[PDB]
Structure formats: C-alpha cells, structure tokens
Write a protein that binds this ligand. Sequence first.
Ligand SMILES: Nc1nc(-c2ccsc2)cc(N(Cc2ccccn2)Cc2ccccn2)n1
Ligand SMILES: Nc1nc(-c2ccsc2)cc(N(Cc2ccccn2)Cc2ccccn2)n1
Ligand SMILES: Nc1nc(-c2ccsc2)cc(N(Cc2ccccn2)Cc2ccccn2)n1
Ligand SMILES: Nc1nc(-c2ccsc2)cc(N(Cc2ccccn2)Cc2ccccn2)n1
Ligand SMILES: Nc1nc(-c2ccsc2)cc(N(Cc2ccccn2)Cc2ccccn2)n1
Ligand SMILES: *[C@@H]1O[C@H](CO)[C@@H](O)[C@H](O)[C@H]1NC(C)=O
Ligand SMILES: *[C@@H]1O[C@H](CO)[C@@H](O)[C@H](O)[C@H]1NC(C)=O
Ligand SMILES: *[C@@H]1O[C@H](CO)[C@@H](O)[C@H](O)[C@H]1NC(C)=O
Ligand SMILES: *[C@@H]1O[C@H](CO)[C@@H](O)[C@H](O)[C@H]1NC(C)=O
Ligand SMILES: *[C@@H]1O[C@H](CO)[C@@H](O)[C@H](O)[C@H]1NC(C)=O
Lengths: 213, 212, 213, 218, 216
Amino acid sequence: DYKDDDDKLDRADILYNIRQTSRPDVIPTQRDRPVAVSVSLKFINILEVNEITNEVDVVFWQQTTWSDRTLAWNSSHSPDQVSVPISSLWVPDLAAYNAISKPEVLTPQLARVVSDGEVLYMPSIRQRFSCDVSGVDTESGATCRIKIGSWTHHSREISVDPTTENSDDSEYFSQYSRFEILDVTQKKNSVTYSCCPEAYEDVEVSLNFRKKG
Amino acid sequence: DYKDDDDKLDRADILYNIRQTSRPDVIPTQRDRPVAVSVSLKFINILEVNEITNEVDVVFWQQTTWSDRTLAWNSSHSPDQVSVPISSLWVPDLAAYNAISKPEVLTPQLARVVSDGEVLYMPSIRQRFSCDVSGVDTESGATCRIKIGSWTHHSREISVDPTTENSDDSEYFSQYSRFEILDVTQKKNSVTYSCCPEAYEDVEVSLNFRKK
Amino acid sequence: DYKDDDDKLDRADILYNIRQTSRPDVIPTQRDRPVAVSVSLKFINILEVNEITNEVDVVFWQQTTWSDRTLAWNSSHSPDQVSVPISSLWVPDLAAYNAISKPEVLTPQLARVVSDGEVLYMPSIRQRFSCDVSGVDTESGATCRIKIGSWTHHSREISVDPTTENSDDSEYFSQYSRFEILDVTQKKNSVTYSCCPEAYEDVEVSLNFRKKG
Amino acid sequence: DYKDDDDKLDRADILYNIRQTSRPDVIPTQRDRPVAVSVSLKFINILEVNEITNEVDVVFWQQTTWSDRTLAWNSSHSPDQVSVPISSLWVPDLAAYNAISKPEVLTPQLARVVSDGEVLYMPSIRQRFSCDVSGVDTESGATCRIKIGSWTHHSREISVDPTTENSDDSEYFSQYSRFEILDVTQKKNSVTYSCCPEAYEDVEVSLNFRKKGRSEIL
Amino acid sequence: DYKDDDDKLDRADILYNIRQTSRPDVIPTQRDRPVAVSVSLKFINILEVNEITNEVDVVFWQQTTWSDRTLAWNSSHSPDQVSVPISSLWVPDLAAYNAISKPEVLTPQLARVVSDGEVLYMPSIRQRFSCDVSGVDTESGATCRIKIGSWTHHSREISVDPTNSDDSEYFSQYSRFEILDVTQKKNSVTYSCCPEAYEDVEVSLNFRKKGRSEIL
Ligand SMILES: Nc1nc(-c2ccsc2)cc(N(Cc2ccccn2)Cc2ccccn2)n1
Ligand SMILES: Nc1nc(-c2ccsc2)cc(N(Cc2ccccn2)Cc2ccccn2)n1
Ligand SMILES: Nc1nc(-c2ccsc2)cc(N(Cc2ccccn2)Cc2ccccn2)n1
Ligand SMILES: Nc1nc(-c2ccsc2)cc(N(Cc2ccccn2)Cc2ccccn2)n1
Ligand SMILES: Nc1nc(-c2ccsc2)cc(N(Cc2ccccn2)Cc2ccccn2)n1
Ligand SMILES: *[C@@H]1O[C@H](CO)[C@@H](O)[C@H](O)[C@H]1NC(C)=O
Ligand SMILES: *[C@@H]1O[C@H](CO)[C@@H](O)[C@H](O)[C@H]1NC(C)=O
Ligand SMILES: *[C@@H]1O[C@H](CO)[C@@H](O)[C@H](O)[C@H]1NC(C)=O
Ligand SMILES: *[C@@H]1O[C@H](CO)[C@@H](O)[C@H](O)[C@H]1NC(C)=O
Ligand SMILES: *[C@@H]1O[C@H](CO)[C@@H](O)[C@H](O)[C@H]1NC(C)=O
C-alpha cells in the first residue's frame, strides 16, 4: 500500500524478514527450474573509443531483475517495496565475457525488493570492452557487441534473458556525448566450450553507434 | 548546552544512545512523510575540463542535511552535538545521475548529530561528470548541470530540497583554479522512465563557469 | 544428478556441508601426497605490448582445478555441483613469478565444487608481465613466457601442473584483438634457489603470438 | 622503565589495558577543555608541480600528537611506550581543506602510546593540493599554502596547534628532489563560514619552495 | 619430519596452535632483547627511471625473517613448516623511508612458520622511490639507495639487519636495465625532535641502462 510507504517500523520489519529468509549464496530456484534473470543495458555514455585496438570505455545502467518468491510478503497494509543492501541478497554472478577492465560501480549497492518477491537491481557501471570499433567514423557506424552471462551457473541453473530486443536508449544516453547511438539490440545466445559439457546462457548486447558529425 | 559540550562521558553516552536507536539501513520517515533531504553543492575547484568530450572534473563540498527525530535527546545539561561515523547512521543513497567516475571522498566519513535529531553530513568529493562544456572559453561561460538524487528511493520515500544561498560561494571556491565561477543555482526536478512510473526527485545544480 | 540441480534446499545443504568441512587455510593433502593443482591459461586479450621495456598487458581466464575429497557428497539424488564463494574454500596460493602488476580479477570470485570433491576455479585476470616481446611484429612472432607456481608451498606440498601441452585458444581469444596466437604451450617446470633447500614445481606458459598483418 | 621495554607480557597487558579503556569514536576531552592536537608537516618530497593548473603533488610526514590521560599507566617497572594500531585509538579527524586527492598513507597505521597518555602518530602521506604555484621558477620561489584542521569538530572541541613555526626541514627533505625548500612556516588559523556558527581551528602550512637550477639556456 | 609434511590434520593442528599463541600486535621480544629482523631485497625488475625527477619504479622480493620461539613446536613426527596468513601473525612494521608510492604487494600474503619458531616472509613488492638516478645511462651506472626500517619501533625494540650480490638468480633477463651490484648495510637514523635511534637497512642498487648509445 502506497499510503504505508513511510511507516518506518513496517520498513524495518520487512528488512528483518528479508534478512531472515535470504540465502545470499544459494541460487533462488523455484519449482526445480532455472532462475530467470532479466538483463537490459541502458547506455549512458561512450567515453573513449579506439579503432586501432578495438576497445571502448562506456557507462551503462544494468537493469537487472529476477524473482525470489520466498522473500514475498503481504503488503496490503505495508510498503510494497524496500531498498536492501545487496550484501543481504543473492545477486546473479553476471560478468561480461569480453570485459577488459573491472566493472566500476558508480552507484549505491542497493536493490529494491518487491512484496511479490521480485528483486530490482540497477548498478551504474563504467567498464572497458574488447569489441568491433571499425566504422565508428562512418554513417552506418560501428557495432560493438558485449556478451553478459553468469560466470559459474549453466543454463539449467540460471537463464540470462534480454528484456527488450530493440531501442536507441533515448531516455538514457547523454546528449552531451561526442557519440550517438544508432541502435541497441539485445538477444539471447548460448555458449558451450569443448572442456565442459553444459551450456551457458547470455545476452548479446549489440551497440550500434557512431561519432557525431 | 554549550557549557557541557566537552563532558566526555556525556558524549560517549550520546553515541551509545544513537547507536542503539539508529537503523542505518532503514529510511528515517517521520509522520507519514518522505525524508526531506537538503542537498547543496559548494564548489571548491574545477580541475580539468574537456570541451571536445564534454567532461568536467570538480571538487565540491556536498552539504547534506536531514532529520531523524528518534535520535533526538534532551541537551539541557549535555552536549548539543556529537560527531558520529556514518557507518553508524542511515545516510541518503544519493548518486549523481550524470557522473562518469566514482565519487572520491576526500574527508573523514563522519556526520554531526544535533540534539534535535538533525544530521549534518558534508563530504568533500572529487568526481567527473558528463555535461555541457560548450562556451567555457567565452565570457558567458559554460553551464554544466549536475543532477543528484536518491538512487533507489522515489518521491514518496525521499524528497530533495535544493534550496540554498549562493552569495557565499566565494568563501568556498579556490582562488587558484584555472577557471572562475560566474554563478551556481539549484532547482528541484523529477525523473521518470517509460519502464518505471514512480517519480525520483533530484537537485539540478547548474554550474556556470569559464576559463580565466 | 542433473534433475535435482535446481533443488534449492539441497543446494543450501551442500553449501552448509562444504563450509562445515572446509579448512580454507590448510592444504588439502590427501594420503601423504602433494596437492595436484592443474593450471591452464586461456588467453582472451593481449591489450598492450611494449617493444622497448619487454612488457605485455594481457587478459586470461585461469582455468584451475584440484580435488579435496573431504568435500565430496552423494549426488545420486542431489545436485552434482554448486557455486561457492572462494572465501569459504582453500585455494592454491598461485602467483606469476614475472608479474609486474597485481592480478586484477574481473569476475565474481566463486568456484564450483563437484560432488566427487573436484574444485573448479577460473578467474578472468588482467595482469602485466615482464617477458620477451622481441619478434612480435614478425611472421614468427614473439614468445612470451609466464611462470606460475605456489608462492609458499614447495613440491612436497603442492604440484602446479599443466593440463594440455598445446592449445589453440580459439574458443577464447578475442577475434577483435590486433594480435593473434600461433601457439600456447604449457609445460612442467621445477625451480630451486641457492638460498633455500626445497624445489618449487611450476607451470611455464609460452605464449607465441604476433601482431596481425 | 627503559629496562622493562622488551617485557613481552607487559606490552601485551598494556595493549589490552589500552583497548579496554579506549573510546575510538569519542573525543578525549579532559576538564571540559578542547583536545589539543599538535600538527607539524615535515615535507619529504615534492613530486610534481603543475604551473598550468596550480597543483602540487607532495609527500610529507604528518607529526601529530595529543594526549588521553585515561590511557596512562604506571611505568615504574613496565614499558614506557608501545605501538598500537590506530583502529584501537581515537585519532583526530584531520583533513586538508585544499586537498584535491585522497591522502595516500605510505606507512603502517600504528601510533605510539606513551605511559603518560601521550599519543604520537606520524603517517607518511602523499597527496595533491590546489595552491599558489606561481614563482616556483624564481629565486624567491613559490609559496603553497596547505590548511589542515578537524573536519567535524569546532574550536571548543578540538584545537589544532602548530608545534613550531619555522624550519627548512633539512633532516627530512630528499636531496634528490628537483625542488628545494626555502622555508616551511606553520601558523594557527581560524575558519568560519557565514552559513554556520562556530569557528574551526586549523594549521596553515606555508611551503616556500623553488625549482633547482631555474636558469636555463632558453 | 618431512615424511609427515602432508599430514593434513597435523597441519590444521599446527595452524590452530600458532593462532592460539600468536599475538599479532605485540613485538615478539625474547629475553628482553630487541627483535632481530633480517631483510634482503632481491630485485626482479626496474620498470621506469626518471633522471629529471630522480625517481625509480621497481619490483623486488623482500626476503624477511625473524623468530618467535613461542610459536615453536616439536616436529619429531609432524610437519616442519606450514604456511600462515600474515593476518594471524606479528609482522614487523617495515617501511621504506624514501618511498613515494604505496608498496604494491603482488603475491599471496602468507608467511612460513618453521617448527623452531622462525618466520619467513617474502612479498613481491612494486614500489616507487626518490633516489639518485644520475649516471644510469653511463658505464658506472646509477646508485639508487633505499632505506628500510621499522616505522614505529626504535633500536631497543627492533633491529633491522642485512643478510653482496648482483641478484643473478632473480633479476629479469628481459629488463631494459641491468644490475651491476646490490649492497645492503646496517644503518642508524635519529632526529632532532626525538631521542631514540631507529635501525634500518640501506640498500644500494647500482644499475645501468642496457646497450647504451654513447659518444666515444
Ligand atoms: N530506469 C529504471 N529502471 C529500473 C529497472 C530496474 C530493473 S528493471 C528496470 C529501475 C529504475 N529505478 C528504480 C531503481 C530500482 C533499483 C535500483 C535502482 N533504481 C528508478 C531510478 C530512477 C533514477 C535513478 C535510479 N533509479 N529506473
Ligand atoms: N560550510 C559548512 N557547511 C556545513 C553544512 C553541513 C550541512 S549543511 C551545511 C557544515 C560545516 N561545518 C560542520 C560540519 C558538519 C559535518 C561535516 C563537516 N562539517 C564546519 C566545517 C568547517 C570546516 C571544515 C568542515 N566543516 N561547514
Ligand atoms: N571454459 C570454461 N572452463 C572452465 C574450467 C574451469 C576449470 S577447468 C575448466 C569452466 C567454465 N565454466 C564453469 C566455471 C566454473 C568455475 C568458474 C568459472 N566458470 C563455464 C563458464 C562459461 C563462460 C564463462 C565462464 N565460465 N568454462
Ligand atoms: N621524526 C619523527 N617524529 C616523530 C614525531 C611524532 C609525533 S611528534 C614527532 C616521531 C618519530 N618517530 C617515532 C614514531 C612515532 C609514531 C609514528 C612513527 N614514528 C621515529 C621515527 C623514525 C623514522 C621513521 C619513523 N619514525 N620520528
Ligand atoms: N628465494 C626465496 N627466498 C626465501 C626467503 C625468505 C626469507 S629468507 C629467504 C624464500 C623463498 N621461498 C619460500 C617462501 C617463503 C615465504 C614466502 C614466499 N616464499 C620459495 C619461493 C620460491 C619461488 C617463489 C616464492 N617463494 N624463496
Ligand atoms: C493479505 O492480507 C489481507 C488482510 O489485510 C487479506 O485480505 C489477503 O487475503 C492477504 N493475502 C494473502 C495472499 O493471504
Ligand atoms: C530535560 O531535562 C531538564 C533537566 O535535566 C528538564 O528541566 C526538562 O524538563 C527536560 N525536558 C525538556 C523537554 O527540556
Ligand atoms: C550413495 O547412494 C545412495 C544415495 O541415495 C545411498 O544408498 C548410498 O548409501 C550412498 N553412499 C554411497 C557411498 O554410495
Ligand atoms: C607505581 O608502582 C610502583 C610499584 O611498582 C610504586 O613504587 C609507585 O609508587 C607507583 N606509582 C604510581 C604513580 O602509582
Ligand atoms: C617430541 O616428541 C617426541 C615424540 O613425538 C618425544 O620423543 C620427544 O621427547 C619430544 N621432545 C623433543 C624435544 O623432541
């Protein structure tokens, strides 16, 4: 109930409940099925681009959602959501397979837990990537691909799925960048390796962008 | 009362009281209202500016205040204020929406808690931003807008109070900067997204500056 | 077995068992044999190569395995593997002898523990090294050698061993790199110092690579 | 007693006593008087001087002393002093008001606690400052002022005091630096803001320095 | 007993014993004498030198030993040594007095404790220093001196002693520089402000650029 959002004792009790039930290191699989993790990158800035080394330096908001129904509660007379330090929650062990620098989180490491068990997590991340920068100076642009998946959980445990397939992130991308976004595509993809018998799901984010004229 | 400020045992007891009552992870909402957080930036320096990439590197003191009256105490015969490590307190989850680097905090991470429950927190922060640098070499200067608000709390939980005086800006800005500040103004705005209907309040700080 | 992989309570119980049994600071010697640690570097990116200083800056996935049978469980009707934060596990104290920067871990610090007690750990690491960079711009390329072993455990305690002797690394290396790999060889190597009595059993990784034409 | 300095059990017991008594988060005010903190910067090196941005990058040892008589013990037959991790102690919340980088501490974060309750703390700090760099290439040199006080305690709570106003720092400054120090002056200074009531004390450190071999062909 | 080195329970038990006895924050002064700390720097690389600013950036293995007999155990039928996280141990508060950057430790922070109570600690450290780089491009080379001693313990509490080489087993063959000589000598430091003497090791790194181009 929105009207109870500012009831501090309710918020405290919800946080307590969440911390009692939460298993931060155990995947929250329900009904013996993979955890469905929804991922969408919203690019904010393209800071540096190197056509020689095929590297980009970018900032994006990583819109991330999943469900853990064990966290649910009846919010008929209490806040429908609270903010929770992610140290109290399981968070998917996502990583970009072509990152060449640490993900630098620029934002408070908090998630929102919804009373129906949904968890919303959106770090702003600055990170560098190895990807195809060729054509950045042309009108058709470069198409830089970023692959994001679970670092240790295979497809039977975690499914990593794109939320939206297409956008030019108009609400998000800085108008002040020297680059402009032509199109952002996000599709599912499965990866396997000769060493290991299982498949790993990821989202392939295709960033089509060019230098402004 | 100020006469009792240096009573050490009193200070220790106040710190104990604050730590027993404090909920560092819960917003301190009082009487069915959002936490009103006052935020004003006092710019100290402009260090690097890039008109090609539209990026600025600045240092500011982030004046931050809010109330948590559950922290209040009777100070008739005890200190009026104490310093408290912010790890012992709830602090607003503010973030700069157009920051392109982590906020580098240059100062001890302590706040003051006043006996009426007011909390004062003022980190000196160095941070880089993406903003409009065009006009920095002209006499009308550039206007770089920095937007700061809660990262996870919407308007019914945290409201931002942007109201501040700016006639004292020269007490703060370094005389040895390569840049000069012409004007600083702040206004409230609201931020919403297609995906997400709740409104998030922010303060837009318009920094109007130019190369000396 | 895989049909019980998503039994959350089972996973939680296995994580509990591992944490009860694990001794993170004690080498998992079994019988009276050294711990056999298998190491293979899968190169992802060669980012900087410095002609003059003989330095390279690389990203690699450090495939690392060893066994601790005390961690084993019956997975007839339970998950075959779980992810475990490495803070809960003993991990080999590996270091590159010719590293000239800290290993920067780019990925979640989790390992897999298998029900037969095998541990699988593979951080993505960015690190700089001092090695022979001569020939990088030639057909035959440069051969940069990286020596990896236990920092404090000698050969009676830990053996650091190669998995495969040669690798094409084609499933791993970035196709957008400005370099390409001719061969990666990884061989056993023993090191002694005149100051000190014991031998240290390490893996010598020879990265034969060149700038793309 | 100097003869008992190396009695390990005594040192352990002193460290235990200190940890039992210490309130790391509470100012050690005595007699309703402000804590007197003595600060003296001994410059070790001037790493970089940017004439375009008016910035210096320096290394200094921050000689810091104060007392907490609650920590005192009878050293008639026990060590005079011990080293203590500063995480076990209250330490003044000092900040440089014109710093433009974090203070990077190059030394183990230990203090000495003396049996009379004196605390001695001296980190080696590398840090960047915004200050007047003009004149660095002249004979009279540049004068870069660094202002250091408590970040959150006003003058009734902490007073910050220079140990000594004038030195050339001969025992400390590297002979291999590109620069040379003419004089370091450190004076008391009081800071107030029209926004806020009380006064904050600080030490104003004026670093008078110049480039070696300022005279060039071209 | 080396035959028992890999007895896991024995190792776990030794680790337990060490952690029960260890006082990580108290100097292990035995018999009212200062702790004798042995230090030898084995240089691995010289990464950058600047003859204008007189600064060097180097990597070295800091061979460090001292003893704490209270840690000693009977190894007749148990391991001779175990590795121990240094967070469980007292370690000397060493610092380089002319360092101009933080010591960057490149290696797992473990020490070996020997059953006679000897502790061996050897971090690989990357660090920058202010020292004399003049002469680096010449035959004679430069001689960069690095002073390392206790940051807070004077000579009555800690003595820091050198254990004379060109570091051939350690220095990188692929460095741009080459080492002519490394000497390490005892040294004593005092200040006007302060009575006590502080012991340090003064390390002299005599090195030069490889394959110089000179005017003959
Ligand atoms: N565009 C957007 N997307 C998501 C989101 C998240 C998952 S799917 C979609 C969440 C979100 N906000 C709520 C939120 C929840 C959790 C963490 C951070 N923020 C609003 C908002 C406004 C301004 C600064 C930051 N956030 N905003
Ligand atoms: N200009 C200014 N603004 C605020 C403030 C805070 C919120 S609204 C306004 C507080 C403040 N001081 C008290 C204080 C409280 C908390 C943290 C840090 N400082 C005095 C002062 C003096 C010199 C260095 C630093 N501070 N000074
Ligand atoms: N190529 C590959 N090798 C190993 C491996 C490990 C030891 S020997 C061989 C493990 C592994 N995965 C499982 C795993 C377990 C532990 C840590 C990290 N990853 C799948 C995978 C897929 C894509 C990104 C990362 N991981 N993938
Ligand atoms: N020059 C100097 N000044 C002070 C000092 C301190 C406060 S007022 C004056 C203390 C001090 N030493 C003792 C000490 C105590 C605490 C922390 C660090 N060191 C000797 C010394 C020698 C060489 C390296 C480091 N220290 N040396
Ligand atoms: N050359 C050398 N010196 C010492 C040493 C130490 C004190 S006096 C002499 C110790 C040592 N090793 C044992 C050891 C113990 C503690 C920490 C690290 N290493 C072998 C070794 C081999 C290769 C990489 C690393 N270590 N190696
Ligand atoms: C939640 O509580 C309300 C009573 O306030 C009740 O009407 C409703 O059925 C409850 N929901 C569930 C799922 O039990
Ligand atoms: C506070 O304490 C004083 C004396 O200790 C008393 O006079 C007063 O009534 C108390 N309450 C308030 C609100 O001042
Ligand atoms: C493993 O298999 C089943 C588990 O259901 C059980 O009968 C048996 O005791 C287990 N243990 C071993 C050693 O096989
Ligand atoms: C300290 O203790 C000694 C005995 O060990 C005694 O002679 C002396 O009077 C004591 N001093 C104080 C100040 O208590
Ligand atoms: C050590 O233990 C052995 C038995 O394990 C015993 O014979 C011996 O007396 C003990 N003491 C020494 C100093 O070896």
